[PDB]
Structure formats: C-alpha cells, structure tokens
Specification:
heterotrimer, A mainly alpha (27), B mainly beta (250), C little secondary structure (10), A: 27 residues, mainly alpha, Epsilon-Thrombin, Chain L, 1 helix, 26% helix, C: 10 residues, little secondary structure, elongated, binds ligand CCR, Thrombin light chain (chain A), Hirudin-2 (chain C)
Chain lengths: 27, 250, 10
C-alpha cells in the first residue's frame, strides 16, 4: 500500500548513504 | 552485523527487536509487515536441541528503535504478543528448512517517521531481484565479531551468491527455501550477519517502483564473516503462501 | 546492559 516507502527517505525524496550501491548492482 | 556501519535514522523503519522479558535481553531481529504483524525466523522462537521454546508472554517486540540498549522515549513503541505462528514444516532437526514465523501483536502499532512496514515480494519481484550479484541489505543489533555489541543499529549490503557456490561452501543440505549472500574472498569487501541478527530482514529496493521488499530472513551461518563462508537466508517469496494463509485465517 | 523499560509493558 505505502509499504516499503520510508518516511525519512522515499516519501521526502531523500536517499540514504548506500542505497545507490544496491541500484548499481541491479544490472 | 560484522563489517557493516551505523544505520542512519529512519533507514530501516520496519526493523523490529525481539526482546526477552526476563532476563531482559536481545533475542533476535524481526520485521514489521503490517500494523499488527511481525515476521521473524522460527529458530528465534523454537529450537528444542537447546531447549528453546518461547511463548507469547516471554517476549516483547520493540519497534522504531535505533539505539540497542536505550529506552527510546517518544520514539520506539513496545508491543505485546497475541499469538505466535511457526511454519508447521520448519525443520529444526536437520537444516532449519522453512525457517519462518509470524507474530500477531495485541494492538496495532502507530506508524511514524521511525515505524513503517516493509513490502513482501510477489513472484515477479522475486524473479527480477533474486539474482546472483544483485545486492540486498541486512540490519541488526547482533554481534560485531564472531568471537562486541553495537551502540546503534548496524547495516551491511551484500551480494546474493550463485547456488552452486553456496552449496559448495558448506556440508549442510541447502533447500529451495534458502539462499545465501556475501562476498567471495577474491572480492575483498566483507560483511555478514552474526549472533543476535537472526530473524532480521534482508531487503532489496526495487528499481521498478522504488519500494523496499523483504526477500530474506537471517537464518544461519557457520561462524560469522569467515572467508569462504556465506550467510544463509530464508527465501521469503517461497514461503509466501503460508504467510498468506496465516494472515487471511487469523 | 539494557535500560529498564516502563512498568506498563512489564
Ligand atoms: C539445525 O540446523 C543448524 C543448527 C546449528 C546448531 C547451526 S550452527 O552451525 O551452530 N550455526 C549457528 C552459528 C554457529 O554457531 O556457528 C547459527 O546459524 N546460529 C544462528 C544465528 C546466526 C545466523 C546467521 C549467521 C551468519 N550469517 N553468519 C550467524 C549466526 C542461530 O541463532 N540459530 C539458533 C540455534 C540453531 C542454529 C540457528 C546451523 C548452521 C544449522 C543449519
């Protein structure tokens, strides 16, 4: 529903310090 | 968590601590999947060879936490258990196959900046994300080393490993309800879960809809962050029909 | 060692 969307990150369009490392692995 | 780093505030708002009442200590990790349901590893609750068999009144779950030992007034929420459900085919005698359990809370938990459910995968998100090389994220208040304890929630990102490589790293019989993750020794980076991280989530952020999905549960390993060894995780999607069944029923 | 939690939760 709103599962999996973090109030302090996705909901306010902020990224945490390492989520890009995951993205980069999803080739 | 070995060789990880401090989590940011609100980084893992589905993280749950399973806390023993007396003596007051950290049992395990767990995850928030709705306002009344928490997911964890069966072994966190039931492991007869070690005379572990907790009932509802033995435990509390603490939600919204960052610091490990602090009471986080006005932030964390502490919940009592209404009922525990363990997978009826959980194989504690052999290899912890189907290492999964649900806990229903006595009252719904108020969502907040610090408290929020993770998503469970459907077939397509698992086929799309559960690939060798793709990284997931593990969090917990568990040991920092195989052989102290963190002041705050720890985080580490680890690649999913090829099934034949997982199989060849251990004498334990691996099943389709498990996957393994971690770096190889030739990779140089790293990290692992460890004692006290058990039952916490392995999540991945879908690049399709930008949501976090829980693909795994911290299940087992042989030591922690040993070269040539890998952490093993309960395959959540694979056990999703049982999860569905319990929640629909109860 | 853990900080004590409010009585209510036990
Ligand atoms: C019945 O199946 C078992 C039973 C045991 C006794 C063990 S184990 O060798 O003791 N491994 C321990 C760790 C060890 O002593 O070397 C373990 O996995 N412990 C987990 C916690 C854990 C989880 C993951 C990791 C990691 N990724 N490095 C490390 C530790 C646990 O609490 N239990 C409860 C007791 C039964 C085993 C699982 C294992 C692997 C299996 C599959």
């Amino acid at each position: 529903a709103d599962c999996g969307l973090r109030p302090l990150f996705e909901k306010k369009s902020l990224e945490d310090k390492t989520e890009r490392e995951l993205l980069e692995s999803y080739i | 968590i070995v060789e990880g780093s401090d989590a940011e505030i609100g980084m893992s708002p589905w993280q749950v601590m399973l806390f023993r009442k007396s003596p007051q200590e950290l049992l395990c990790g767990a995850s928030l999947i709705s306002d009344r349901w928490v997911l964890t590893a069966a072994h966190c609750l039931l492991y007869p060879p070690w005379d572990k068999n907790f009932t509802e009144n033995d435990l509390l779950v603490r939600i919204g936490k960052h610091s490990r030992t602090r009471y986080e007034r006005n932030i964390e929420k502490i919940s009592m258990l209404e009922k525990i459900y363990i997978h009826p085919r959980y194989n504690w005698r052999e290899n912890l196959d189907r290492d999964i359990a649900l806990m229903k809370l006595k009252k719904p938990v108020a969502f907040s900046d610090y408290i929020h459910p993770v998503c469970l995968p459907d077939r397509e998100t698992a086929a799309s994300l559960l690939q060798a090389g793709y990284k997931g994220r593990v969090t917990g208040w568990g040991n920092l080393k195989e052989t102290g304890q963190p002041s705050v929630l720890q985080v580490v990102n680890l690649p999913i490993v090829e099934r034949p490589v997982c199989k060849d790293s251990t004498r334990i019989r691996i099943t389709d309800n498990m996957f393994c993750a971690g770096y190889k020794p030739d990779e140089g980076k790293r990290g692992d879960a460890c004692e006290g991280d058990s039952g916490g989530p392995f999540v991945m952020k879908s690049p399709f809809n930008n949501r976090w999905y829980q693909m795994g549960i911290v299940s087992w390993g042989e030591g922690c962050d040993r070269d040539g060894k890998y952490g093993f995780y309960t395959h959540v999607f694979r056990l999703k029909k049982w999860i569905q069944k319990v929640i629909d029923q109860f | 060692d853990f900080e004590e939690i409010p009585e209510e939760y036990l």
